[PDB]
Design a protein around this ligand. Structure first.
Ligand SMILES: *[C@@H]1O[C@H](CO)[C@@H](O[C@@H]2O[C@H](CO)[C@@H](O)[C@H](O)[C@@H]2O)[C@H](O)[C@H]1NC(C)=O
Ligand SMILES: *[C@@H]1O[C@H](CO)[C@@H](O)[C@H](O)[C@H]1NC(C)=O
Lengths: 48, 48
């Protein structure tokens, strides 16, 4: 536990995580990329 | 219509639908739910 270095009054949101990937992550692979996950059939590039 | 419902019954009466005579593309099953647990036992979810 380390809620003394990942915490402060008024909050912090420095950390990040990925819920949206085109496939699973194979063992020991990094996937640093910011690509909007597709829904339906739209080539959409944007949030919403 | 099993993921678009409104009154998924309580566990004391587990609603049991039957799915037959159909083509099962689980990609739609992957769209109506930001999963928290896809634990598959008999089959691998990738090969469904
Ligand atoms: C479980 O819940 C499903 C979704 O509500 C039900 O499927 C539908 O039920 C409606 C009636 O509410 C039907 O008109 C429709 O054709 C479809 O079957 C399902 O019946 C229900 N199952 C049980 C056992 O309650
Ligand atoms: C349920 O059906 C409505 C009908 O318009 C749709 O907008 C909504 O996205 C559906 N939600 C789920 C979780 O299936």
């Amino acid at each position: 536990n380390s809620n003394k270095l990942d915490s402060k009054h008024s909050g912090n949101y420095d950390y990040w995580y990925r819920l949206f990937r085109k496939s699973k992550l194979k063992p020991f692979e990094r996937d640093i990329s910011t690509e909007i996950y597709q829904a339906g059939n739209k080539p959409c590039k944007g949030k919403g | 219509e099993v993921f678009n419902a409104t009154r998924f019954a309580s566990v004391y009466a587990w609603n049991r639908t039957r799915i037959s005579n159909c083509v099962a593309d689980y990609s739609v099953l992957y769209n109506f739910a930001p999963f928290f647990a896809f634990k598959c036992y008999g089959v691998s979810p990738t090969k469904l």
